[PDB]
Amino acid sequence: ENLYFQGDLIVSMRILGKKRTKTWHKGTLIAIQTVGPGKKYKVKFDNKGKSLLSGNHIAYDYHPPADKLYVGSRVVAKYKVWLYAGIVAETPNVKNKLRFLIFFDDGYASYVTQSELYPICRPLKKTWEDIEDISCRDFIEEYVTAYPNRPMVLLKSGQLIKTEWEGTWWKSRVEEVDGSLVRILFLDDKRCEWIYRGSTRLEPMF
Numbered sequence: 001e002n003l004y005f006q007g008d009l010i011v012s013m014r015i016l017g018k019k020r021t022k023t024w025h026k027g028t029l030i031a032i033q034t035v036g037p038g039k040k041y042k043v044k045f046d047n048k049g050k051s052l053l054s055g056n057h058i059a060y061d062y063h064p065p066a067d068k069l070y071v072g073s074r075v076v077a078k079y080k081v082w083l084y085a086g087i088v089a090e091t092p093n094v095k096n097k098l099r100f101l102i103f104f105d106d107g108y109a110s111y112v113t114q115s116e117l118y119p120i121c122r123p124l125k126k127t128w129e130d131i132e133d134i135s136c137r138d139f140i141e142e143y144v145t146a147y148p149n150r151p152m153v154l155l156k157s158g159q160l161i162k163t164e165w166e167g168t169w170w171k172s173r174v175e176e177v178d179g180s181l182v183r184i185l186f187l188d189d190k191r192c193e194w195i196y197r198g199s200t201r202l203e204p205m206f
């Protein structure tokens with residue numbers, strides 16, 4: 001059946017849609033289709049294209065209030081400017097300077113503000129089940145379900161550690177700590193990465 005209304009969605013509303021590049025883009029909802037118990041959403045993008053999308057691949061074109069976001073919430077966030085999907089890992093508190101921690105689907109971790117987030121319209125019941133990479137999906141499942149139990153390593157600037165990258169352990173130095181993230185300098189290539197302090201990639205004991 002073709003619908004005009006579905007929950008709080010209405011044909012002709014402004015929306016974000018996921019493209020095949022995995023980046024998200026502004027568009028208009030032009031149709032809502034039911035296929036059995038399933039639903040699909042047709043989006044005409046502002047520049048290029050039409051797509052027929054599942055409800056976990058569209059997002060509202062506004063910023064969610066803080067009270068609607070939980071650990072595990074499925075969101076689209078500004079990525080450094082692209083829009084990319086992720087999962088809320090922390091909500092604002094004193095220890096993170098009132099920011100949201102986002103774990104992006106590709107494994108990137110960043111603190112963002114509410115103005116950098118868009119809520120996904122119809123997330124999966126287990127929100128991590130549409131993460132493509134099984135290693136990434138399993139980490140997120142474990143993190144979200146164990147929360148607020150979060151084993152982390154206490155690191156300090158200047159500390160020498162080994163950090164995993166592409167299957168091997170590299171000599172590295174802690175440059176800076178920002179809440180639950182640590183900025184690691186790899187000593188061989190002298191390049192930095194922000195890493196979650198509960199990552200098994202971090203080995204201070206060697």
Ligand SMILES: CC(=O)NCc1ccccc1-n1c(C)nnc1C
Binds near residue numbers: 103106136137139199
């Ligand atoms: C940069 C970061 O720590 N992201 C968290 C994360 C989120 C999802 C999947 C993997 C990871 N991860 C990476 C990448 N390194 N360790 C872990 C855990």
